[PDB]
Amino acid sequence: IRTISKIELSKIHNRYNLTVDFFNDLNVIHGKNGAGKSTLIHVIANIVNGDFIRFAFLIFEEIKATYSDGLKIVIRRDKIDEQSFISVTLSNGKYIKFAVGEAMATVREIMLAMDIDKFVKENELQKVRASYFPAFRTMLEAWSSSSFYNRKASAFARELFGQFLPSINYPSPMEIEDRLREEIRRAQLGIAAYESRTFSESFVKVFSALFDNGELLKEIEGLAIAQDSSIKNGYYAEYSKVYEEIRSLINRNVENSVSGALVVYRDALRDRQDYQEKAFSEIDNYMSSVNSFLEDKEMAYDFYPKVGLKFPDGSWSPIRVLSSGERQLLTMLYAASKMGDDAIVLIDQPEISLHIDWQEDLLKRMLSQLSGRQIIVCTHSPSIATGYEDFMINISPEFI
């Protein structure tokens, strides 16, 4: 896919210059205080989202962005006739110049943005989005709970930290709960459709065995024990009873059709178990990644679907009772999940409120979900970057 490979900054804030070279899988940016880590993340997020109207609020001279496929974007801020003009130049030669004051007026109002998105959609610059995790995730999550959430939180955060700040669009824990519920409902409906298919399929499978001529019952017993003791079933979970009836009628009653019917029944049980496992594959992988961190609780679902945290006494609690660090762990693992939106994950200070035993495993458990996405983190903590020192990037900007 398309990944950021180079960012050059010239006279940004009229203060410094900075050229950064990236990897395509993982980048761990680090540097001193005020070195421009957060500004680099903001520039990357605004470029990747195609939100060039943010650049009216940044004082700079030239920003060069290079992607993986060779696409190059050059953004310039010229000053002519005591007016500032933003110039965006692609590698195709197509360009768009718009006035700063018009962009400021559209900001005060919230036409030019329509021209901008037509230019972006024409040149396919929104092929991959960017999930921006700011350094103030905790108070923003607490504020928003007291895409509309993205819009309101973006307005409030740009009110506080300036209008250059990108659109906040990382998955909040309430969004995580809603998407988990939607995936659980879809998995149940998929199980319903698969059962209706295998229902009509097994009738002609049995009908085929009527025209053709021990341990199988034990294997069916094992499959029925596994399915009856499965949390993914809440309804018609009495396979042990019908298995006992079947084995009683077998011991009461050698025809080859009986053995073929036993084969069909074993295949139907294991096939239903296989589709039931593949329907809940992403949810179980995400909850296994989360529950590898939590100590005295376990995130789990139960059936109407309930999604919460089981404690060792069996009591349930909502996701709102989690602490700040545990909620941040939930969000950062969901952004790298397969059920999360495919994007470029930009995290600013992922080490906030995380114990060092979790900081050592955060990047490992994000990369072990095989999302294939590019992850860029800016950290001050050496325990985040341990084990991945080949991907560390040290930025030392040249101040003027």
């Binding site: 680090h30 060092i356 050592e360 950290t379 001050h380 050496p382 325990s383 970057a385 341990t386 560390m392």
Partner: protein, 305 residues
């Protein structure tokens, strides 16, 4: 840089509840991770590297072993951490024959030593080297090259040990890495003879001192036991020396069919990255543990964590 100091890391040991292992380099971390994951793929041991720990002392800055010894000394008695160092030439006797005074893994309050000179000495079992080189080969004349290499490997270890001892006598450890080239090696009827090439980029004084030390140490190494001899070879030196010896044997036995093809394959093998060789050897070494009784590993260290 973004790394812990000695005191900060000691505090991290107090705060963290994981089972930890401290090793010298990052390559040691990757190899030991494969070793641990063979016995327990779900193991939760976290391995730290002393290479990524800043030291305030200038002398201790690039002395990885001294960092490990300092840390081990200051938390001596902790339960959750184990230490591994490189034995180097410690506990070896050079009284006209190579003698190992330990012949076992060293242990001193969660501080362990590799059985050989370093961690890479575990790779010097002949079966591991064979399997790994066969797997990582140009695939042109592999079978005959492996058969010849399997014949040469018994006596070549004496040559490698002599090279390492000659390097440490004149303190020019990195000298054999750039001095000896695979073309200089000659494949005889089971033996090898690194001819002193007349032309070398390095000064003749270093070359002459190296060959004087090599000649003065070779009969002593010959009289020593092969098993003891295979463990004293320096870890980084041995890998490259085997790479050159295999490039030489491949070109020696494949030039008659096609000299250019053999030379291209030999140069290709010689141009292979060290990291590629270490990873291939590590995979072969992991697979041979438990199959052959002649493959060693730090069993005490694995048991302790």
């Amino acid at each position: 840089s973004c790394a812990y100091t000695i005191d900060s890391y000691i505090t991290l040991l107090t705060m963290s509840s994981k089972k930890r292992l401290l090793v010298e380099g990052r390559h040691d971390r990757s190899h030991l991770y494969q070793l641990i994951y063979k016995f327990n793929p779900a193991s939760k041991v976290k391995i730290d590297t002393a290479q990524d720990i800043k030291a305030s002392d200038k002398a201790m800055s690039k002395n990885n072993r001294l960092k490990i010894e300092t840390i081990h000394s200051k938390v001596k008695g902790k339960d959750n951490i184990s230490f591994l160092c490189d034995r180097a030439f410690r506990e070896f006797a050079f009284n006209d024959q190579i003698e190992d005074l330990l012949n076992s893994h060293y242990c001193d309050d969660s501080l362990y030593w590799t059985l050989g000179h370093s961690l890479e000495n575990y790779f010097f079992n002949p079966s591991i080297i064979i399997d790994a080189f066969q797997f990582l080969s140009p695939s042109e004349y592999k079978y005959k090259a492996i058969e010849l290499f399997s014949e040469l490997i018994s006596s070549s270890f004496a040559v490698l040990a002599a090279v390492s001892l000659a390097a440490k006598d004149i303190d020019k450890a990195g000298l054999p890495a750039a001095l000896i080239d695979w073309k200089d090696i000659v494949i005889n009827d089971g033996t090898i003879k690194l001819i002193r090439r007349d032309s070398y980029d390095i000064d003749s004084a270093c070359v002459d001192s190296f060959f004087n030390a090599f000649d003065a140490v070779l009969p002593r190494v010959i009289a020593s036991d092969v098993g003891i001899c295979s463990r004293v070879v320096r870890g980084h030196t041995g890998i490259l020396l085997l790479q050159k010896l295999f490039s030489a044997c491949l070109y020696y036995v494949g030039r008659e069919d096609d000299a250019l093809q053999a030379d291209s394959s030999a140069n290709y093998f010689c141009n292979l990255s060290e990291l590629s060789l270490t990873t291939a050897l590590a995979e072969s070494w992991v697979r041979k543990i438990g199959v052959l009784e002649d493959v060693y590993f730090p069993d005490s260290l694995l048991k302790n964590i």
